Design a protein around this nucleic acid. Structure first.
Lengths: 76, 74
DNA sequence: CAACCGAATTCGGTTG
DNA sequence: CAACCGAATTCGGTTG
């Protein structure tokens, strides 16, 4: 139960519009979260993956705006 | 990873729960907004420590309509 | 890549 | 514990 993920951080509307784009080819990830945040003016997009291979591909072929920050990690 | 808990349930139900959780914020690090994966909602609660999370679970009141899930993240 | 559109959703806070 | 309330935010899709 160690899921590979990444956290995309940046403007809330920006992350939302990005999600829209990431979801055009939903085969490169398991699922994407709604645009959330901690209760900070920035938002957060959570993306999970079925495997290191799937996540690895995503990071090699998916364009993330320089405005968005990328954080690689895991959850349970 | 950081010790956390995911609280699943009605989204408005969760929002109101977070409001309440803030009354005893001495036993948790931070609480997230009400989110979901793209009818039910999710609240993510992080903790300063493993023991802090335990004291939270045994002190805070979680609605039977809200599933509690222990885990780690980031 | 994100500012923008109208609408549905979520927010803190209240009330019962 | 959450239906409710007024008000702010977030949403999917569009557009430049």
């Amino acid at each position: 139960h160690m899921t590979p993920i990444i956290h995309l951080k940046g403007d809330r509307n920006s992350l939302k519009c990005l999600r829209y784009r990431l979801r055009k080819h939903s085969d490169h990830y398991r699922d994407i979260s709604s645009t959330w945040h901690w209760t900070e003016k920035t938002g957060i997009l959570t993306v999970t993956y079925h495997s290191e291979t799937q996540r690895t591909k995503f990071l090699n072929t998916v364009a993330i705006p320089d405005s968005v920050q990328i954080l690689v990690g895991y959850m349970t």
